[PDB]
Amino acid sequence: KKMAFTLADRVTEEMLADKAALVVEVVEENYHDAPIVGIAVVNEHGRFFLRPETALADPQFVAWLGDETKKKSMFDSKRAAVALKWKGIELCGVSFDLLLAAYLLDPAQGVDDVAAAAKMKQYEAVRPDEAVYGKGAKRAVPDEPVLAEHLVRKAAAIWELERPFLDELRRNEQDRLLVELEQPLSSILAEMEFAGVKVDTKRLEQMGKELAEQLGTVEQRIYELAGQEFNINSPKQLGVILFEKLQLPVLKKTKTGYSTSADVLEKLAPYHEIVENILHYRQLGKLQSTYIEGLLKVVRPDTKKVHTIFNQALTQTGRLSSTEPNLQNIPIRLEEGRKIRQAFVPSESDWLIFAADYSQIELRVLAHIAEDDNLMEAFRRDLDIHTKTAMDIFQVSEDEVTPNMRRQAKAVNFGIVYGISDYGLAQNLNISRKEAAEFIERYFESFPGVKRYMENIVQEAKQKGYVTTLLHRRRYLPDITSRNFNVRSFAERMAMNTPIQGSAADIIKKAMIDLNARLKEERLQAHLLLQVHDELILEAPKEEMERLCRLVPEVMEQAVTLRVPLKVDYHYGSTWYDAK
DNA sequence: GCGATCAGCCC
DNA sequence: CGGGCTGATCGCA
Ligand SMILES: Nc1ccn([C@H]2C[C@H](O)[C@@H](COP(=O)(O)OP(=O)(O)OP(=O)(O)O)O2)c(=O)n1
Ligand SMILES: OC[C@H]1O[C@@](CO)(O[C@H]2O[C@H](CO)[C@@H](O)[C@H](O)[C@H]2O)[C@@H](O)[C@@H]1O
Ligand SMILES: OC[C@H]1O[C@@](CO)(O[C@H]2O[C@H](CO)[C@@H](O)[C@H](O)[C@H]2O)[C@@H](O)[C@@H]1O
Ligand SMILES: [Mg+2]
């Protein structure tokens, strides 16, 4: 049965009620400077569809959109807010976002459209976006009659589903998480995305030139050593050269052929000079294709800025993800790739990049939740946690900790957070399961509180069916009861890791909210640009650095109060690279 | 074209 | 052993 609604040619007062479900449709996946194809409004007075050129040109409608006292319920309000920012229109008063609501209730559902969210409550009087717009090359906006009914049905679903979703969030003790954390954060992310990050394209282009030269040299050297030319970028062709023509040992295989991952190649290096060249080629090629070419493809020609989109409702742990471009995985470990960061610069003259990061937030969170006396004491003394772990598991004094011991203790600490496993640790340290198991046992002997926590959290996940974070984020783990060892073990590691990674996500998200409030109160021009899981990157006038050096770490350190202190390091400079 | 496979970058 | 995104190649269409 078709849904009734008014296909309006003009905006009326009835459409501007102080409470409504609103749909500002942006079909393009990347909504930056994207078209708004239609608008739907559902309120106490009825259901309405408005053509964008009409509504967005109407003073009354624009004013309604920007009035904080006029409450709107939406799905993915950030998408609408940003698309409107590019049009110079402010969206305020969004009191409920169905996308974020669904995400908090169950991240695993992968809710990506109104239909998916509605199906959670047995509401199916709305079609999936893909069914309406199609996919890939076939994607397209349908004729007005079809478009209008779809947007109205989506607004109608939001209107009907708000109460049921809020009720369940309240039962889950997650309503404040939505209203005081995720929704306010959505607006902050919208500002960050819209501001974008300035890129020194000339810098990138020059790097690309030099890489091309280096790649040419290495490429030829490879063919020389192989005695023939082939596609190095083809694990298939490369495998034949290495394991068949050159007869190198097959230390590991892939489900479809020979493994050629860096991990394996490093072990084969002693056998043939071609290996190091392949590794070098892989390194340069990664920088060239993914970072130089990749970044240049998404930089806006007119402003020379890149505008990422932070997916706030995707990860199973509460973290954000970044796309087109992903600015959360810019090289830093290796000097060559690290130089790419010199291309990320302040958007204004005489401004600088300021970066602040939490020091070991995950292990500090673990110390807090596990209430491990030894681990808490370690952080209260602000000790080098890896050196400390080495001293405990290897039974030696600080002065007796060798570089290799610290390196292995560090790997153990990662495993503990990820959800320890002899097999996983062994592969990482290139040792045996028996040996790796010995490290684990020694770790738990030194940190019995952590052992108790790991045991207890797994039991809790099985009993309740899910685990939670400091701010009540939730993750269901149905596989925790599986009779399949591999499937069950993965779920157990998730039970151990989610509260840690998840709570760290909760903390930095609150820090971002607290920070923006402080920056506004202080009337600073500084503003957030990026978040990279445990770090915040801002840009600001050089005259604001001294104030930021005190303000940013304090706000981040005081976001939440744990049984151990939170510690934040910071750096600033002329480019992201120099913010070290 | 579309998508599984393999690779490698980040925290 | 935890959580992500993107680019290359290549079978399949
Ligand atoms: N109705 C609620 C209550 C709590 N929370 C989330 C966000 C809060 O910041 C966090 C802590 O809530 P409280 O301070 O009330 O702590 P509880 O009393 O919930 O203790 P516990 O966190 O151990 O459940 O949990 C929420 O989203 N909705
Ligand atoms: O707007 C982001 C928001 O939309 C979803 C779908 O509801 O993702 C879409 O937009 C992303 C940004 O361009 C794309 O990466 C993704 O492929 C597209 O479906 C949500 O997942 C997200 O929270
Ligand atoms: O002492 C058992 C020990 O094994 C773990 C897995 O390492 O859990 C197993 O035993 C539990 C019963 O005590 C089951 O609930 C669980 O499903 C099974 O895998 C640890 O959690 C536990 O400490
Ligand atoms: Mg750090």
PDB file of N, CA and C in Angstrom, chain A residues 172-229:
ATOM      1  N   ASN A 172      19.476  -0.650  28.098  1.00  0.00           N
ATOM      2  CA  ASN A 172      20.882  -1.049  28.010  1.00  0.00           C
ATOM      3  C   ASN A 172      21.796  -0.088  28.766  1.00  0.00           C
ATOM      4  N   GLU A 173      21.227   0.995  29.291  1.00  0.00           N
ATOM      5  CA  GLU A 173      21.999   2.025  29.987  1.00  0.00           C
ATOM      6  C   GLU A 173      22.991   2.633  28.997  1.00  0.00           C
ATOM      7  N   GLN A 174      22.496   2.901  27.793  1.00  0.00           N
ATOM      8  CA  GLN A 174      23.297   3.481  26.718  1.00  0.00           C
ATOM      9  C   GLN A 174      22.711   4.779  26.177  1.00  0.00           C
ATOM     10  N   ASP A 175      21.610   5.254  26.752  1.00  0.00           N
ATOM     11  CA  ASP A 175      21.003   6.478  26.235  1.00  0.00           C
ATOM     12  C   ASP A 175      21.909   7.700  26.356  1.00  0.00           C
ATOM     13  N   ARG A 176      22.658   7.803  27.449  1.00  0.00           N
ATOM     14  CA  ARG A 176      23.569   8.934  27.609  1.00  0.00           C
ATOM     15  C   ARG A 176      24.724   8.786  26.614  1.00  0.00           C
ATOM     16  N   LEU A 177      25.138   7.548  26.360  1.00  0.00           N
ATOM     17  CA  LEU A 177      26.212   7.295  25.401  1.00  0.00           C
ATOM     18  C   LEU A 177      25.817   7.875  24.036  1.00  0.00           C
ATOM     19  N   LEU A 178      24.552   7.715  23.655  1.00  0.00           N
ATOM     20  CA  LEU A 178      24.087   8.258  22.378  1.00  0.00           C
ATOM     21  C   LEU A 178      23.943   9.781  22.410  1.00  0.00           C
ATOM     22  N   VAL A 179      23.188  10.262  23.394  1.00  0.00           N
ATOM     23  CA  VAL A 179      22.886  11.681  23.538  1.00  0.00           C
ATOM     24  C   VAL A 179      24.003  12.615  23.994  1.00  0.00           C
ATOM     25  N   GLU A 180      24.869  12.139  24.879  1.00  0.00           N
ATOM     26  CA  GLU A 180      25.949  12.971  25.394  1.00  0.00           C
ATOM     27  C   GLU A 180      27.309  12.713  24.753  1.00  0.00           C
ATOM     28  N   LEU A 181      27.459  11.581  24.068  1.00  0.00           N
ATOM     29  CA  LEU A 181      28.744  11.274  23.436  1.00  0.00           C
ATOM     30  C   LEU A 181      28.715  11.170  21.910  1.00  0.00           C
ATOM     31  N   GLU A 182      28.099  10.120  21.373  1.00  0.00           N
ATOM     32  CA  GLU A 182      28.095   9.949  19.922  1.00  0.00           C
ATOM     33  C   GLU A 182      27.425  11.064  19.113  1.00  0.00           C
ATOM     34  N   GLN A 183      26.256  11.537  19.533  1.00  0.00           N
ATOM     35  CA  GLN A 183      25.617  12.592  18.764  1.00  0.00           C
ATOM     36  C   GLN A 183      26.414  13.901  18.800  1.00  0.00           C
ATOM     37  N   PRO A 184      26.915  14.312  19.979  1.00  0.00           N
ATOM     38  CA  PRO A 184      27.684  15.561  19.965  1.00  0.00           C
ATOM     39  C   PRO A 184      28.969  15.378  19.153  1.00  0.00           C
ATOM     40  N   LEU A 185      29.552  14.185  19.234  1.00  0.00           N
ATOM     41  CA  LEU A 185      30.780  13.900  18.500  1.00  0.00           C
ATOM     42  C   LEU A 185      30.546  13.966  16.995  1.00  0.00           C
ATOM     43  N   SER A 186      29.362  13.549  16.559  1.00  0.00           N
ATOM     44  CA  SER A 186      29.035  13.570  15.138  1.00  0.00           C
ATOM     45  C   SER A 186      29.186  14.978  14.560  1.00  0.00           C
ATOM     46  N   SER A 187      28.744  15.978  15.316  1.00  0.00           N
ATOM     47  CA  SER A 187      28.840  17.369  14.879  1.00  0.00           C
ATOM     48  C   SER A 187      30.295  17.815  14.816  1.00  0.00           C
ATOM     49  N   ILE A 188      31.104  17.323  15.751  1.00  0.00           N
ATOM     50  CA  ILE A 188      32.520  17.669  15.776  1.00  0.00           C
ATOM     51  C   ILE A 188      33.224  17.038  14.570  1.00  0.00           C
ATOM     52  N   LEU A 189      32.875  15.792  14.263  1.00  0.00           N
ATOM     53  CA  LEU A 189      33.468  15.115  13.121  1.00  0.00           C
ATOM     54  C   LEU A 189      33.074  15.843  11.836  1.00  0.00           C
ATOM     55  N   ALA A 190      31.841  16.338  11.781  1.00  0.00           N
ATOM     56  CA  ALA A 190      31.370  17.073  10.607  1.00  0.00           C
ATOM     57  C   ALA A 190      32.238  18.310  10.390  1.00  0.00           C
ATOM     58  N   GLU A 191      32.560  19.013  11.475  1.00  0.00           N
ATOM     59  CA  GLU A 191      33.393  20.211  11.369  1.00  0.00           C
ATOM     60  C   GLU A 191      34.797  19.842  10.891  1.00  0.00           C
ATOM     61  N   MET A 192      35.340  18.758  11.439  1.00  0.00           N
ATOM     62  CA  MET A 192      36.683  18.307  11.075  1.00  0.00           C
ATOM     63  C   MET A 192      36.765  17.940   9.598  1.00  0.00           C
ATOM     64  N   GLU A 193      35.794  17.157   9.144  1.00  0.00           N
ATOM     65  CA  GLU A 193      35.749  16.721   7.756  1.00  0.00           C
ATOM     66  C   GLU A 193      35.621  17.905   6.809  1.00  0.00           C
ATOM     67  N   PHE A 194      34.739  18.832   7.162  1.00  0.00           N
ATOM     68  CA  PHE A 194      34.504  20.020   6.350  1.00  0.00           C
ATOM     69  C   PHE A 194      35.739  20.926   6.271  1.00  0.00           C
ATOM     70  N   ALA A 195      36.458  21.070   7.381  1.00  0.00           N
ATOM     71  CA  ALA A 195      37.654  21.911   7.397  1.00  0.00           C
ATOM     72  C   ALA A 195      38.707  21.321   6.470  1.00  0.00           C
ATOM     73  N   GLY A 196      38.862  20.002   6.545  1.00  0.00           N
ATOM     74  CA  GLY A 196      39.835  19.318   5.717  1.00  0.00           C
ATOM     75  C   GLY A 196      41.261  19.604   6.152  1.00  0.00           C
ATOM     76  N   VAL A 197      42.215  18.986   5.461  1.00  0.00           N
ATOM     77  CA  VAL A 197      43.629  19.177   5.762  1.00  0.00           C
ATOM     78  C   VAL A 197      44.328  19.633   4.487  1.00  0.00           C
ATOM     79  N   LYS A 198      45.100  20.707   4.604  1.00  0.00           N
ATOM     80  CA  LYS A 198      45.821  21.268   3.470  1.00  0.00           C
ATOM     81  C   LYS A 198      46.984  20.372   3.075  1.00  0.00           C
ATOM     82  N   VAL A 199      47.148  20.171   1.774  1.00  0.00           N
ATOM     83  CA  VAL A 199      48.219  19.334   1.256  1.00  0.00           C
ATOM     84  C   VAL A 199      49.156  20.138   0.358  1.00  0.00           C
ATOM     85  N   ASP A 200      50.455  19.916   0.518  1.00  0.00           N
ATOM     86  CA  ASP A 200      51.461  20.586  -0.304  1.00  0.00           C
ATOM     87  C   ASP A 200      51.619  19.658  -1.505  1.00  0.00           C
ATOM     88  N   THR A 201      50.769  19.838  -2.513  1.00  0.00           N
ATOM     89  CA  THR A 201      50.803  18.983  -3.698  1.00  0.00           C
ATOM     90  C   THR A 201      52.128  19.014  -4.461  1.00  0.00           C
ATOM     91  N   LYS A 202      52.776  20.173  -4.511  1.00  0.00           N
ATOM     92  CA  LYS A 202      54.057  20.279  -5.203  1.00  0.00           C
ATOM     93  C   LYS A 202      55.046  19.343  -4.517  1.00  0.00           C
ATOM     94  N   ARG A 203      54.990  19.319  -3.188  1.00  0.00           N
ATOM     95  CA  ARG A 203      55.863  18.468  -2.387  1.00  0.00           C
ATOM     96  C   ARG A 203      55.621  17.007  -2.755  1.00  0.00           C
ATOM     97  N   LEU A 204      54.353  16.610  -2.784  1.00  0.00           N
ATOM     98  CA  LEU A 204      54.002  15.237  -3.128  1.00  0.00           C
ATOM     99  C   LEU A 204      54.434  14.884  -4.547  1.00  0.00           C
ATOM    100  N   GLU A 205      54.238  15.812  -5.479  1.00  0.00           N
ATOM    101  CA  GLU A 205      54.603  15.561  -6.867  1.00  0.00           C
ATOM    102  C   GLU A 205      56.102  15.346  -7.030  1.00  0.00           C
ATOM    103  N   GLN A 206      56.900  16.084  -6.263  1.00  0.00           N
ATOM    104  CA  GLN A 206      58.349  15.935  -6.342  1.00  0.00           C
ATOM    105  C   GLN A 206      58.756  14.584  -5.766  1.00  0.00           C
ATOM    106  N   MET A 207      58.116  14.189  -4.668  1.00  0.00           N
ATOM    107  CA  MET A 207      58.420  12.906  -4.051  1.00  0.00           C
ATOM    108  C   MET A 207      58.084  11.814  -5.054  1.00  0.00           C
ATOM    109  N   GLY A 208      56.944  11.967  -5.719  1.00  0.00           N
ATOM    110  CA  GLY A 208      56.525  10.993  -6.708  1.00  0.00           C
ATOM    111  C   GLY A 208      57.554  10.843  -7.812  1.00  0.00           C
ATOM    112  N   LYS A 209      58.144  11.963  -8.221  1.00  0.00           N
ATOM    113  CA  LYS A 209      59.156  11.957  -9.272  1.00  0.00           C
ATOM    114  C   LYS A 209      60.365  11.136  -8.843  1.00  0.00           C
ATOM    115  N   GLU A 210      60.864  11.414  -7.643  1.00  0.00           N
ATOM    116  CA  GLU A 210      62.024  10.703  -7.118  1.00  0.00           C
ATOM    117  C   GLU A 210      61.749   9.224  -6.879  1.00  0.00           C
ATOM    118  N   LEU A 211      60.515   8.894  -6.507  1.00  0.00           N
ATOM    119  CA  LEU A 211      60.153   7.501  -6.276  1.00  0.00           C
ATOM    120  C   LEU A 211      60.170   6.762  -7.604  1.00  0.00           C
ATOM    121  N   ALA A 212      59.607   7.392  -8.630  1.00  0.00           N
ATOM    122  CA  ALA A 212      59.563   6.794  -9.957  1.00  0.00           C
ATOM    123  C   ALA A 212      60.976   6.438 -10.406  1.00  0.00           C
ATOM    124  N   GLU A 213      61.924   7.329 -10.128  1.00  0.00           N
ATOM    125  CA  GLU A 213      63.314   7.100 -10.500  1.00  0.00           C
ATOM    126  C   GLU A 213      63.879   5.913  -9.724  1.00  0.00           C
ATOM    127  N   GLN A 214      63.678   5.920  -8.409  1.00  0.00           N
ATOM    128  CA  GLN A 214      64.165   4.839  -7.564  1.00  0.00           C
ATOM    129  C   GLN A 214      63.538   3.508  -7.955  1.00  0.00           C
ATOM    130  N   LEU A 215      62.240   3.527  -8.242  1.00  0.00           N
ATOM    131  CA  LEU A 215      61.535   2.315  -8.635  1.00  0.00           C
ATOM    132  C   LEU A 215      62.076   1.768  -9.950  1.00  0.00           C
ATOM    133  N   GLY A 216      62.421   2.668 -10.867  1.00  0.00           N
ATOM    134  CA  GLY A 216      62.955   2.244 -12.147  1.00  0.00           C
ATOM    135  C   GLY A 216      64.269   1.509 -11.966  1.00  0.00           C
ATOM    136  N   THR A 217      65.135   2.063 -11.125  1.00  0.00           N
ATOM    137  CA  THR A 217      66.437   1.471 -10.850  1.00  0.00           C
ATOM    138  C   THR A 217      66.287   0.102 -10.190  1.00  0.00           C
ATOM    139  N   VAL A 218      65.513   0.047  -9.110  1.00  0.00           N
ATOM    140  CA  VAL A 218      65.290  -1.205  -8.395  1.00  0.00           C
ATOM    141  C   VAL A 218      64.614  -2.229  -9.304  1.00  0.00           C
ATOM    142  N   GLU A 219      63.643  -1.767 -10.082  1.00  0.00           N
ATOM    143  CA  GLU A 219      62.916  -2.636 -10.996  1.00  0.00           C
ATOM    144  C   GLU A 219      63.864  -3.331 -11.969  1.00  0.00           C
ATOM    145  N   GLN A 220      64.761  -2.558 -12.573  1.00  0.00           N
ATOM    146  CA  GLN A 220      65.714  -3.114 -13.524  1.00  0.00           C
ATOM    147  C   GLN A 220      66.682  -4.070 -12.842  1.00  0.00           C
ATOM    148  N   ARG A 221      67.119  -3.708 -11.642  1.00  0.00           N
ATOM    149  CA  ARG A 221      68.045  -4.541 -10.889  1.00  0.00           C
ATOM    150  C   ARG A 221      67.397  -5.888 -10.604  1.00  0.00           C
ATOM    151  N   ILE A 222      66.092  -5.870 -10.356  1.00  0.00           N
ATOM    152  CA  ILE A 222      65.351  -7.093 -10.083  1.00  0.00           C
ATOM    153  C   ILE A 222      65.321  -8.005 -11.311  1.00  0.00           C
ATOM    154  N   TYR A 223      65.029  -7.437 -12.477  1.00  0.00           N
ATOM    155  CA  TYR A 223      64.993  -8.231 -13.702  1.00  0.00           C
ATOM    156  C   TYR A 223      66.383  -8.782 -13.988  1.00  0.00           C
ATOM    157  N   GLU A 224      67.397  -7.988 -13.661  1.00  0.00           N
ATOM    158  CA  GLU A 224      68.782  -8.383 -13.876  1.00  0.00           C
ATOM    159  C   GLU A 224      69.105  -9.609 -13.029  1.00  0.00           C
ATOM    160  N   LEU A 225      68.734  -9.553 -11.753  1.00  0.00           N
ATOM    161  CA  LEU A 225      68.985 -10.650 -10.827  1.00  0.00           C
ATOM    162  C   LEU A 225      68.119 -11.874 -11.110  1.00  0.00           C
ATOM    163  N   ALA A 226      66.946 -11.653 -11.691  1.00  0.00           N
ATOM    164  CA  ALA A 226      66.036 -12.751 -12.003  1.00  0.00           C
ATOM    165  C   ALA A 226      66.347 -13.362 -13.366  1.00  0.00           C
ATOM    166  N   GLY A 227      67.125 -12.643 -14.169  1.00  0.00           N
ATOM    167  CA  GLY A 227      67.477 -13.132 -15.489  1.00  0.00           C
ATOM    168  C   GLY A 227      66.355 -12.971 -16.494  1.00  0.00           C
ATOM    169  N   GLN A 228      65.344 -12.187 -16.132  1.00  0.00           N
ATOM    170  CA  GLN A 228      64.207 -11.955 -17.015  1.00  0.00           C
ATOM    171  C   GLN A 228      63.260 -10.915 -16.426  1.00  0.00           C
ATOM    172  N   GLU A 229      62.365 -10.397 -17.259  1.00  0.00           N
ATOM    173  CA  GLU A 229      61.401  -9.407 -16.807  1.00  0.00           C
ATOM    174  C   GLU A 229      60.068 -10.072 -16.496  1.00  0.00           C
TER     175      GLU A 229
END
